[PDB]
Protein backbone atom coordinates (compact mmCIF):
# COMPACT_ATOMS: atom_id res chain seq x y z
CA UNK A 1 0.00 0.00 0.00
CA UNK A 2 1.54 3.35 -0.94
CA UNK A 3 2.42 5.44 2.13
CA UNK A 4 4.50 8.48 1.13
CA UNK A 5 2.41 11.67 1.12
CA UNK A 6 3.25 13.02 -2.30
CA UNK A 7 2.98 9.73 -4.22
CA UNK A 8 -0.35 9.04 -2.37
CA UNK A 9 -1.64 12.44 -3.48
CA UNK A 10 -0.54 11.83 -7.07
CA UNK A 11 -2.20 8.38 -7.23
CA UNK A 12 -5.45 9.96 -5.81
CA UNK A 13 -5.20 12.58 -8.64
CA UNK A 14 -4.51 9.78 -11.16
CA UNK A 15 -7.50 7.79 -9.86
CA UNK A 16 -9.71 10.89 -10.46
CA UNK A 17 -8.20 11.45 -13.86
CA UNK A 18 -8.68 7.81 -14.93
CA UNK A 19 -12.23 7.81 -13.59
CA UNK A 20 -13.06 11.02 -15.58
CA UNK A 21 -11.42 9.65 -18.77
CA UNK A 22 -13.44 6.45 -18.47
CA UNK A 23 -16.64 8.44 -17.95
CA UNK A 24 -15.97 10.79 -20.88
CA UNK A 25 -15.32 7.76 -23.07
CA UNK A 26 -18.65 6.06 -22.08
CA UNK A 27 -20.44 9.42 -22.87
CA UNK A 28 -18.57 9.68 -26.22
CA UNK A 29 -19.38 6.04 -27.09
CA UNK A 30 -23.07 6.70 -26.77
CA UNK A 31 -22.74 9.90 -28.89
CA UNK A 32 -20.72 8.07 -31.60
CA UNK A 33 -23.45 5.28 -31.71
CA UNK A 34 -26.14 8.03 -32.07
CA UNK A 35 -24.17 9.72 -34.89
CA UNK A 36 -23.63 6.53 -37.00
CA UNK A 37 -20.09 5.67 -36.03
CA UNK A 38 -20.57 2.22 -34.33
CA UNK A 39 -16.89 1.18 -34.66
CA UNK A 40 -15.58 4.42 -33.10
CA UNK A 41 -18.18 3.77 -30.34
CA UNK A 42 -16.68 0.29 -29.85
CA UNK A 43 -13.19 1.84 -29.62
CA UNK A 44 -14.37 4.32 -26.94
CA UNK A 45 -16.02 1.56 -24.87
CA UNK A 46 -12.91 -0.62 -25.08
CA UNK A 47 -10.53 2.19 -24.11
CA UNK A 48 -12.99 3.09 -21.25
CA UNK A 49 -12.38 -0.47 -19.92
CA UNK A 50 -8.59 0.06 -20.14
CA UNK A 51 -9.03 3.23 -17.96
CA UNK A 52 -11.08 1.10 -15.49
CA UNK A 53 -8.07 -1.16 -15.32
CA UNK A 54 -5.67 1.78 -14.66
CA UNK A 55 -8.08 3.33 -12.04
CA UNK A 56 -8.57 -0.05 -10.27
CA UNK A 57 -4.75 -0.49 -10.20
CA UNK A 58 -4.25 2.93 -8.51
CA UNK A 59 -7.16 2.29 -6.18
CA UNK A 60 -5.71 -1.06 -4.94
CA UNK A 61 -2.23 0.64 -4.65
CA UNK A 62 -3.82 3.17 -2.34
CA UNK A 63 -5.26 0.23 -0.21
CA UNK A 64 -8.88 1.33 -0.77
CA UNK A 65 -10.40 -2.00 -1.87
CA UNK A 66 -11.71 -4.27 0.93
CA UNK A 67 -14.29 -6.91 1.31
CA UNK A 68 -17.93 -6.38 0.29
CA UNK A 69 -19.21 -5.09 3.58
CA UNK A 70 -16.46 -2.50 3.88
CA UNK A 71 -16.88 -1.50 0.19
CA UNK A 72 -20.66 -1.05 0.93
CA UNK A 73 -19.75 1.14 3.87
CA UNK A 74 -17.53 3.33 1.58
CA UNK A 75 -20.62 3.67 -0.63
CA UNK A 76 -22.84 4.52 2.32
CA UNK A 77 -20.40 7.28 3.45
CA UNK A 78 -20.03 8.69 -0.05
CA UNK A 79 -23.71 8.77 -0.81
CA UNK A 80 -24.57 10.21 2.60
CA UNK A 81 -22.01 13.04 2.00
CA UNK A 82 -23.64 13.78 -1.34
CA UNK A 83 -27.16 13.75 0.27
CA UNK A 84 -26.43 15.83 3.35
CA UNK A 85 -23.59 18.13 2.35
CA UNK A 86 -22.46 18.32 -1.31
CA UNK A 87 -25.62 18.33 -3.48
CA UNK A 88 -27.83 20.50 -1.17
CA UNK A 89 -25.09 23.13 -1.15
CA UNK A 90 -24.33 22.92 -4.91
CA UNK A 91 -28.08 23.00 -5.71
CA UNK A 92 -28.62 26.09 -3.45
CA UNK A 93 -25.62 27.85 -5.02
CA UNK A 94 -26.90 27.11 -8.53
CA UNK A 95 -30.33 28.48 -7.56
CA UNK A 96 -28.70 31.61 -6.04
CA UNK A 97 -26.70 32.12 -9.26
CA UNK A 98 -29.70 31.55 -11.51
CA UNK A 99 -28.18 28.55 -13.30
CA UNK A 100 -31.29 26.55 -14.04
CA UNK A 101 -29.60 23.54 -15.83
CA UNK A 102 -27.32 23.10 -12.76
CA UNK A 103 -30.31 23.32 -10.39
CA UNK A 104 -31.81 20.48 -12.47
CA UNK A 105 -28.72 18.22 -12.66
CA UNK A 106 -27.92 18.56 -8.97
CA UNK A 107 -31.62 17.93 -8.01
CA UNK A 108 -31.62 14.77 -10.27
CA UNK A 109 -28.51 13.43 -8.66
CA UNK A 110 -29.50 14.29 -5.06
CA UNK A 111 -32.88 12.48 -5.27
CA UNK A 112 -31.14 9.32 -6.55
CA UNK A 113 -28.32 9.39 -3.99
CA UNK A 114 -30.90 9.26 -1.20
CA UNK A 115 -32.10 5.94 -2.62
CA UNK A 116 -28.50 4.66 -3.15
CA UNK A 117 -27.56 5.27 0.49
CA UNK A 118 -30.58 3.27 1.70
CA UNK A 119 -30.03 0.39 -0.75
CA UNK A 120 -26.37 0.13 0.37
CA UNK A 121 -27.40 0.23 4.07
CA UNK A 122 -29.89 -2.70 3.33
CA UNK A 123 -27.22 -4.59 1.45
CA UNK A 124 -24.60 -4.17 4.16
CA UNK A 125 -26.98 -5.57 6.84
CA UNK A 126 -27.17 -8.79 4.62
CA UNK A 127 -23.55 -8.98 3.68
CA UNK A 128 -22.46 -8.47 7.35
CA UNK A 129 -24.37 -11.83 8.04
CA UNK A 130 -22.77 -13.46 5.01
CA UNK A 131 -25.94 -13.33 2.91
CA UNK A 132 -26.45 -11.87 -0.53
CA UNK A 133 -29.42 -9.55 -0.98
CA UNK A 134 -32.64 -10.79 -2.54
CA UNK A 135 -33.22 -8.48 -5.48
CA UNK A 136 -34.23 -9.83 -8.92
CA UNK A 137 -34.05 -6.62 -10.99
CA UNK A 138 -32.88 -3.02 -10.68
CA UNK A 139 -34.38 -0.26 -12.79
CA UNK A 140 -32.53 2.97 -13.53
CA UNK A 141 -33.99 6.09 -15.22
CA UNK A 142 -31.70 7.07 -18.19
CA UNK A 143 -32.77 10.78 -17.77
CA UNK A 144 -32.09 11.38 -14.12
CA UNK A 145 -30.64 8.21 -12.63
CA UNK A 146 -33.56 7.49 -10.35
CA UNK A 147 -33.13 4.01 -9.05
CA UNK A 148 -35.79 1.41 -8.10
CA UNK A 149 -35.57 -2.23 -7.11
CA UNK A 150 -37.74 -5.11 -8.37
CA UNK A 151 -40.48 -2.99 -10.03
CA UNK A 152 -40.20 0.32 -12.06
CA UNK A 153 -42.59 3.07 -10.83
CA UNK A 154 -45.34 3.95 -13.29
CA UNK A 155 -43.41 7.15 -14.02
CA UNK A 156 -40.17 8.48 -12.55
CA UNK A 157 -41.01 10.76 -9.64
CA UNK A 158 -38.01 12.93 -10.32
CA UNK A 159 -38.17 13.72 -14.07
CA UNK A 160 -41.58 12.32 -15.21
CA UNK A 161 -40.29 9.69 -17.58
CA UNK A 162 -42.56 6.73 -18.21
CA UNK A 163 -41.80 3.25 -16.73
CA UNK A 164 -41.00 2.01 -20.31
CA UNK A 165 -37.81 4.08 -20.50
CA UNK A 166 -36.22 2.65 -17.45
CA UNK A 167 -33.05 0.59 -18.07
CA UNK A 168 -33.25 -2.82 -16.50
CA UNK A 169 -30.42 -4.73 -14.77
CA UNK A 170 -31.29 -8.36 -14.30
Report the interface residues with Fe ion, using CB under 5 A: 18, 51, 54, 79, 109, 113, 116, 141, 143-144, 146, 156, 158-159, 161
Q: Tell me which of a second copy, Fe ion, none is bound by residue 161, counting a contact when its beta carbon lies within the kind-specific cut-off of 5 to 8 angstroms.
A: Fe ion
User: Smallest distance from the beta carbon of 85 to a second copy, in angstroms?
Assistant: 11
Q: Which is nearer to Fe ion, 81 or 131 (CB)?
A: 81
| Residue 29: partners with Cβ closer than 8 Å, 6 or more residues away | 41, 42, 44, 45, 48
Give the residue with the Cβ less far from Fe ion, 131 or 151: 151
CA–CA separation, 116 and 133 (whole Å): 14
> Is residue 82 marked as binding?
yes
Q: What DSSP string runs through 93-125?
A: HHHHTT-HHHHHHHHHHHHHHHHHHHHHHHHHH
Smallest distance, a second copy to C-beta of residue 147, A: 5
Residue 152: name its binding partner from a second copy, Fe ion, none (Cβ under 5 to 8 Å by kind): none
Phi-psi region of 98 (alpha: psi -120 to 50; beta: other; left: phi over 0): left
**Residue nearer to a second copy on the CB measure, 13 or 151:** 13
Distances from the Cα of 115 to the Cα of 51, 55, 78, 146, 147, angstroms = 28, 26, 13, 8, 7
CB of 154 to a second copy, least distance (A): 19
Binding residues: 18, 51, 54, 79, 82, 113, 116, 141, 144, 156, 159
Amino acid sequence: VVKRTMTKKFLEEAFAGESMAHMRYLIFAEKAEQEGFPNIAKLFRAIAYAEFVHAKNHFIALGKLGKTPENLQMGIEGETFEVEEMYPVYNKAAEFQGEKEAVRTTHYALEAEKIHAELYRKAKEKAEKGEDIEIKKVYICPICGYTAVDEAPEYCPVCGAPKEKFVVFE
